[PDB]
Amino acid sequence: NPKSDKFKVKRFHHIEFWCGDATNVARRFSWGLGMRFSAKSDLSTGNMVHASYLLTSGDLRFLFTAPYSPSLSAGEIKPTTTASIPSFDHGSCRSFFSSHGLGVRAVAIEVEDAESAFSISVANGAIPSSPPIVLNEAVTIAEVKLYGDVVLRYVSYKEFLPGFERVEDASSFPLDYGIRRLDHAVGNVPELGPALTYVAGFTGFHQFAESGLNSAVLASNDEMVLLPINEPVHGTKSQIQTYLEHNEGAGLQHLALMSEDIFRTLREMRKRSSIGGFDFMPSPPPTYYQNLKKRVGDVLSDDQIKECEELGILVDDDQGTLLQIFTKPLGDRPTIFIEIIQRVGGCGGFGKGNFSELFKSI
Amino acid sequence: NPKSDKFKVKRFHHIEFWCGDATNVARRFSWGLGMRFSAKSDLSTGNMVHASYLLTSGDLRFLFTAPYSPSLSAGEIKPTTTASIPSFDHGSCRSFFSSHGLGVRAVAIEVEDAESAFSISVANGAIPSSPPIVLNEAVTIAEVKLYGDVVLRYVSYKEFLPGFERVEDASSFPLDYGIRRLDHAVGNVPELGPALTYVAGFTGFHQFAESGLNSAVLASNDEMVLLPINEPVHGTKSQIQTYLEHNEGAGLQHLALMSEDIFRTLREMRKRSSIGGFDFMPSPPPTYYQNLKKRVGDVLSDDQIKECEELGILVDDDQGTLLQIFTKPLGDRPTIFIEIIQRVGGCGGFGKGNFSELFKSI
Ligand SMILES: O=C1CCCC(=O)C1=C(O)c1ccc(C(F)(F)F)cc1[N+](=O)[O-]
Ligand SMILES: O=C1CCCC(=O)C1=C(O)c1ccc(C(F)(F)F)cc1[N+](=O)[O-]
Numbered sequence: 001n002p003k004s005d006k007f008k009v010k011r012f013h014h015i016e017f018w019c020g021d022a023t024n025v026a027r028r029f030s031w032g033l034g035m036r037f038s039a040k041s042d043l044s045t046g047n048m049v050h051a052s053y054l055l056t057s058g059d060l061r062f063l064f065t066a067p068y069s070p071s072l073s074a075g076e077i078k079p080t081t082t083a084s085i086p087s088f089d090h091g092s093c094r095s096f097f098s099s100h101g102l103g104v105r106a107v108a109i110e111v112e113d114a115e116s117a118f119s120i121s122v123a124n125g126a127i128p129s130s131p132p133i134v135l136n137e138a139v140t141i142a143e144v145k146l147y148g149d150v151v152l153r154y155v156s157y158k159e160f161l162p163g164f165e166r167v168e169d170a171s172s173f174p175l176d177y178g179i180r181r182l183d184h185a186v187g188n189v190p191e192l193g194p195a196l197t198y199v200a201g202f203t204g205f206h207q208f209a210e211s212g213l214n215s216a217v218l219a220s221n222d223e224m225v226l227l228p229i230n231e232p233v234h235g236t237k238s239q240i241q242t243y244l245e246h247n248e249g250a251g252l253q254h255l256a257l258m259s260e261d262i263f264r265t266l267r268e269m270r271k272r273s274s275i276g277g278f279d280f281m282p283s284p285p286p287t288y289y290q291n292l293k294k295r296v297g298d299v300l301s302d303d304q305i306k307e308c309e310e311l312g313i314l315v316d317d318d319q320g321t322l323l324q325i326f327t328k329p330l331g332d333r334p335t336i337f338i339e340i341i342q343r344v345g346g347c348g349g350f351g352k353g354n355f356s357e358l359f360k361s362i
Numbered sequence: 363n364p365k366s367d368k369f370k371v372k373r374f375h376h377i378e379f380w381c382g383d384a385t386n387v388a389r390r391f392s393w394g395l396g397m398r399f400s401a402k403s404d405l406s407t408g409n410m411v412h413a414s415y416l417l418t419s420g421d422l423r424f425l426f427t428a429p430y431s432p433s434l435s436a437g438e439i440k441p442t443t444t445a446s447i448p449s450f451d452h453g454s455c456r457s458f459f460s461s462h463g464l465g466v467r468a469v470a471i472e473v474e475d476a477e478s479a480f481s482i483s484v485a486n487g488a489i490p491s492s493p494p495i496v497l498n499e500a501v502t503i504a505e506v507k508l509y510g511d512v513v514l515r516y517v518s519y520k521e522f523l524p525g526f527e528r529v530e531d532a533s534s535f536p537l538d539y540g541i542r543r544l545d546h547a548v549g550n551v552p553e554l555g556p557a558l559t560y561v562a563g564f565t566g567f568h569q570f571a572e573s574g575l576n577s578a579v580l581a582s583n584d585e586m587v588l589l590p591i592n593e594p595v596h597g598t599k600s601q602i603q604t605y606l607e608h609n610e611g612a613g614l615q616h617l618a619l620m621s622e623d624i625f626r627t628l629r630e631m632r633k634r635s636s637i638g639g640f641d642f643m644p645s646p647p648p649t650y651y652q653n654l655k656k657r658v659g660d661v662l663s664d665d666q667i668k669e670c671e672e673l674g675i676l677v678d679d680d681q682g683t684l685l686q687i688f689t690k691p692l693g694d695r696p697t698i699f700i701e702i703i704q705r706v707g708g709c710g711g712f713g714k715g716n717f718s719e720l721f722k723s724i
C-alpha cells in the first residue's frame with residue numbers, strides 16, 4: 001500500500017443505473033433488496049429532462065435515471081436547463097440502454113474536490129466524460145470515462161444532490177434488510193492489461209490482488225474503494241466472454257453490497273425471490289459444506305456452518321474470512337448481477353478460492 | 363346492438379407491453395397486481411431475439427416483451443428465426459420504447475380464424491401491421507394498426523403460444539388478489555372522428571356509448587370486447603392532451619381489469635403501494651360518499667358504502683351499477699394507468715357520471 005493516489009478519495013458515494021423506465025426498476029430493487037425510497041427528481045419537482053429516483057439502505061445509495069420525451073425540454077439549453085444531473089443526455093442514455101440494456105452508468109466516488117480531481121485525472125490520461133459542474137454553490141460533480149460506457153463520477157461537498165427532494169416520511173416505507181454499504185464494483189474488459197494501467201494511471205490506485213478468467217483489484221489509500229477488473233480466457237465456457245457478447249461491450253459485472261447480518265438479509269430476500277424480488281444462483285451441494293468443517297471449522301460453529309448450507313452461502317484467508325452469495329442476473333440479459341458479502345477494508349479477499357472449492361463437489 | 367361485426371370475435375386474449383427490460387416490469391406487476399408467473403420465452407427456452415414473460419390472473423394475460431442484442435440473432439432470417447412472436451422487430455420495439463416509454467403495444471383479441479379476420483380487416487380499411495403467421499400448425503396470429511403505434515392482434519386456435527414454456531409449479535408463486543378478466547382498453551386519439559370511423563370500419567363494431575374530453579365506445583356483438591376512444595377539448599387542463607404530449611402521440615390510456623372481490627383486491631394492492639406495488643389516485647373527500655347514500659343508498663348497504671370510503675372507491679345506471687378506482691400512472695410518464703372495476707357485458711357504464719359527482723365535493 002504505497003498510498004500513491006493522485007488525489008484524496010473518500011469512499012463510494014452512489015451507483016447510477018440507466019434504464020428506460022426508472023419507476024419499475026426502482027420499485028423492484030426496493031422490494032427485492034430492502035432499500036427505502038429516499039429522494040426523487042422528476043416532473044413533480046420540476047425536472048422536465050430525466051426522472052431520477054434514489055434508493056438508500058444505510059450508506060448505500062442506488063440511483064435510477066430514465067429520460068423523458070425530448071420535446072418536453074426542447075425549449076431549454078444547458079445554462080437554463082431543469083435537470084438535476086447536468087451530465088444527463090437523451091442521446092447517450094438511449095444509446096447506452098439500446099446497446100447494454102439495464103446496466104450501471106456511473107460508479108460515483110466522493111472526493112475532497114471534484115474540480116481538482118477532474119483536472120488531475122484528465123492530465124494523467126483520463127478520457128473526460130463530463131466537465132466539472134457546480135450545483136447550488138455547494139456540490140460539484142465531474143465524470144471521466146472508466147471502461148466501456150461506464151464513467152467514474154467525482155462528487156465533492158462543502159442531502160444527496162440539489163434539485164432532488166426528500167420524499168415524505170409517510171409516503172415511503174422504511175424497508176431495511178441489513179445492507180449498509182457498497183463493498184466493491186467489478187467490471188469486465190476484453191483486456192485487463194490496457195484497462196488496469198489506464199484506470200490506475202489517472203487515479204494512482206495500487207493493485208490489491210482452468211480458471212476461466214484473469215482479474216486484478218485496484219484500491220485507494222485506505223482500501224475503501226475497490227475496483228476489480230476481469231478479463232476472459234479461451235480454451236475451457238468463459239462466462240465473462242458471454243458477458244461481453246450479451247452486454248455488447250465492456251461494463252460493470254456485479255455490485256458487491258455489504259450487510260451487517262448476512263443471514264437476515266438472505267432470509268429476507270430469499271422469501272421474496274418469487275414475489276417480485278431477486279432470484280439467487282444455485283446453491284452448492286452439501287459436499288461443499290462437508291469441506292467447510294475442515295476449512296473454517298476453527299473459524300465458525302457447526303450450528304452456523306449448517307445454517308450457511310440452508311441459505312447456500314459461500315465461505316472463503318490470512319487477514320480474515322468472508323461470506324458471499326451471488327444473485328442471478330438482474331434483468332433479461334445474463335450480464336449484471338448482485339453479490340452479497342459479509343466480512344469479519346477488503347478483508348477476507350474476493351472469494352477467489354471458491355472456484356477450486358466449488359469444483360471439489362464433483 | 364345490430365351485431366354488425368364483419369367477423370366473429372370471441373373475447374380479449376392478452377395484452378402485450380413493450381419495454382426495454384421485461385424482467386423488472388414483470389416482477390413489479392406480478393407483485394403489485396397479483397398475477398402469477400405463467401409462461402416464458404427467452405434464451406433459456408431458445409429465443410435469441412426477444413425476452414417475453416407472461417403474467418396471468420384468472421383469464422387475464424399480461425405479456426411483457428423486451429429485445430435482446432441484435433447480434434445474437436444476426437445469423438438468423440425470418441423463415442429460420444427463433445422468436446416465439448414472429449411479429450417482433452428490434453427496430454420497431456426500440457422506436458416504440460424511445461418514443462412512448464413503457465406502454466401497451468398490442469391489444470390481442472381471440473377470433474374464430476385469424477387468417478380470415480386479417481383479410482376482412484385489411485379489405486375494409488385496416489392498415490396491415492403484421493401478416494398472418496401460422497405457429498406449429500395450431501395457432502395463427504395476425505396484426506393490424508389500431509391507433510398510434512398500438513396494433514390489434516388477432517389470434518385463433520384449433521396453452522398460450524408455441525415456443526413458450528410453462529414455468530414450473532414450484533418456481534412460481536401462485537399470487538392471486540382477485541383480478542380475473544380484462545374489461546375494456548381505452549386509448550387517446552387527437553380526433554375521435556377519424557378514429558371511431560376507422561376502427562369500426564374494418565371491424566363492424568357498433569357504438570356502445572366542462573367535460574374536458576369527448577369519448578365513444580366500440581363493442582362486439584356480445585359486448586365482450588370494449589374499445590373506448592377519447593379525444594381532448596381545449597378551453598378548460600385537458601389531461602388527455604397532456605397524455606398526447608408526454609406519450610408523444612396516440613396510445614392506450616388505461617386498462618380496466620375486472621375483479622370478483624374489489625374490496626379484497628384493493629386491500630391487497632393498497633398494502634403494497636409503498637413496497638414495490640402500484641400507488642392509487644387521491645381518494646375523494648367524504649362529501650362524495652355523503653352523496654353516495656342518496657345515489658346508491660337503495661343499491662348498497664351503509665356498512666359497504668362506508669367501506670368504499672375507506673378504500674376510496676368511485677360508484678356510479680339503468681342496467682346496473684359499477685365500482686371503480688384508478689391507479690396512478692404505471693411508470694415515469696403520466697400516461698398509461700390501471701383501472702380496477704367491479705360490475706353488478708359492459709353493465710354499469712364507464713363511470714361517466716363520476717366527472718360531475720367528483721366536482722360536487724367542492
Ligand atoms: O469479487 C470478485 C472479483 C475477483 C474475481 C471474482 O470472480 C470475484 C467474484 O465476486 C466471484 C467470486 C467467486 C465466484 C465463484 F467461485 F462462486 F464462482 C464467482 C465470482 N464472480 O464471478 O462474481
Ligand atoms: O372508462 C372510461 C372511458 C369513457 C370515459 C372515461 O373517462 C372512462 C374512465 O375510465 C374514467 C371514468 C371516470 C373518471 C373520473 F370521474 F374519476 F374522473 C375518470 C376516467 N378516466 O379518464 O379514466
Ligand SMILES: [Co+2]
Pocket residue numbers: 184186254256339350
Ligand atoms: Co465480487
Ligand SMILES: [Co+2]
Pocket residue numbers: 546548616618701712
Ligand atoms: Co375505463
